């Protein structure tokens, strides 16, 4: 386990073999479990030397060792990754992508993956040096199944990083270019490949509806829905995210999610033991109850209202906050008949109980839901009857105490309610 001092002696001898051996030492050092001396290595000025070895097509072993060493540096902090980039590593790794040694090609893949993932600027800079053709070319085989697992998984993870990040989103033409390959990966039988594809798809659908559209046009929604009900949390998690993003777009885009069978997975998603799954499932549901009355009706037909009632009753508070949002949206666009169904399913009690939440937003949201339900009651004349349920379920006091509340919108609507409906 060489000292940094020795590695530098090795690397600075102009002896190819001493160089090779010193680099290998460096690589083992940087692979150390506890606190590998990345900064030390960086400060010794070794990076340019390493980047230079990447070009020695003759000693492929020093190409490999220096790739690996570089990879372990770039896999660290954003400043560490910057040092690898400043060293000139990007074009050098892109050339390596074409190495006849899979183990070397693979290193280059891994390196570009870590550089692209630092953020959007490095992502784009890597795209500019033309990484995409050589990357995609590594996957230009009729059946992905003939590729080695580790290899495929690295390719998938790297491509995922090139899809990652906002401000800005990746170049559109880059996203067009990558999609068809990313869609093949999304249909692959390997759990890790699947998870990282979904992550990629979820990155790409986080944005303007135009972005959502290019993804949905590829026909991935049915595959997403399938992965939505997988047994592996690492797959479900990103799949739910991609689904959730898509239903933030147009109603027609949301309809494709409904059409693919997505809603049938929500009984279990909305009761999922993992809190974030539940949270995001309720979030997703809120952007579905924000849609058309026919889409709300499908939420109804799938038996999901009793599940929303459930989540509103007992769940992590954040989840409850999403549930309140889903009910307000439901009461907004819903028909009177649908709103009536919501009450019969037991929405009032758990609604009133959350008016005790010391969270200004959820209060504003709930009171909004209460108006919408009252206005439905008005069209039936049944405004009084409702007024009673809310007193019987303990709400009247809370809507009252909320007159005095610090926020304006809160005490405004708190008062509005009492006058129209409670006097």
């Amino acid at each position: 386990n060489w000292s940094v001092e020795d590695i530098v002696k090795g690397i600075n001898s102009n002896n190819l073999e001493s160089q090779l051996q010193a680099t290998q030492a460096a690589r083992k050092l940087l692979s150390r479990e506890k606190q590998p001396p990345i900064d030390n290595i960086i400060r010794a000025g070794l990076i340019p030397k390493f980047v230079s070895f990447l070009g020695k097509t003759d000693c492929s072993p020093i190409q490999f060792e220096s790739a690996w060493a570089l990879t372990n540096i770039a896999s660290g902090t954003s400043e560490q990754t910057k040092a690898v980039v400043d060293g000139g590593a990007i074009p050098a790794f892109i050339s390596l992508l074409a190495s006849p040694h899979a183990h070397i090609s693979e290193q280059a893949v891994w390196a570009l993956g870590n550089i692209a993932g630092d953020g959007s600027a490095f992502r784009d800079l890597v795209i500019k040096h033309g990484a995409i053709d050589p990357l995609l070319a590594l996957l230009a085989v009729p059946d992905l199944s003939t590729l080695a697992c580790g290899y495929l998984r690295n390719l998938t993870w790297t491509l995922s990083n090139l899809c990652r990040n906002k401000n800005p989103a990746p170049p559109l033409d880059a996203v067009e270019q990558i999609l068809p390959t990313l869609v093949r990966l999304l249909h692959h039988n390997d759990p890790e490949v699947l998870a990282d594809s979904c992550w990629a798809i979820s990155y790409l659908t986080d944005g303007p509806n135009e972005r959502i559209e290019m993804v949905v046009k590829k026909g991935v929604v049915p595959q997403l829905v399938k992965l939505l009900g997988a047994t592996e949390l690492p797959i479900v998690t990103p799949a739910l995210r991609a689904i959730g993003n898509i239903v933030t777009g147009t109603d027609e885009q949301t309809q494709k999610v409904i059409d693919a069978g997505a809603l049938a997975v929500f009984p279990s998603l909305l009761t999922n033991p993992k809190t974030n799954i539940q949270k995001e499932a309720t979030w997703t549901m809120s952007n579905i109850t924000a849609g058309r009355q026919d889409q709300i009706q499908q939420v109804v037909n799938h038996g999901l209202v009793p599940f929303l009632v459930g989540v509103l009753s007992k769940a992590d508070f954040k989840t409850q906050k999403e549930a309140a949002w889903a009910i307000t949206n439901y009461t907004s666009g819903g028909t009177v008949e649908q709103i009536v169904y919501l009450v019969h399913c037991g929405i009032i009690e758990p609604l009133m109980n959350l008016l005790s939440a010391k969270d200004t937003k959820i209060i504003q949201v709930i009171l909004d839901a209460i108006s919408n339900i009252f206005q439905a009651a008005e069209k039936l004349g049944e405004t009084e009857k409702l007024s009673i349920m809310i007193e019987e379920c303990g709400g009247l006091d809370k809507i009252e105490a909320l007159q005095r509340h610090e926020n304006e919108s809160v005490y405004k609507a708190s008062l509005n309610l009492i006058e129209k409906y409670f006097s």
Partner: peptide, 8 residues
Amino acid sequence: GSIIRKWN
């Protein structure tokens, strides 16, 4: 309402 919320 009806309000779309992204992000995540």
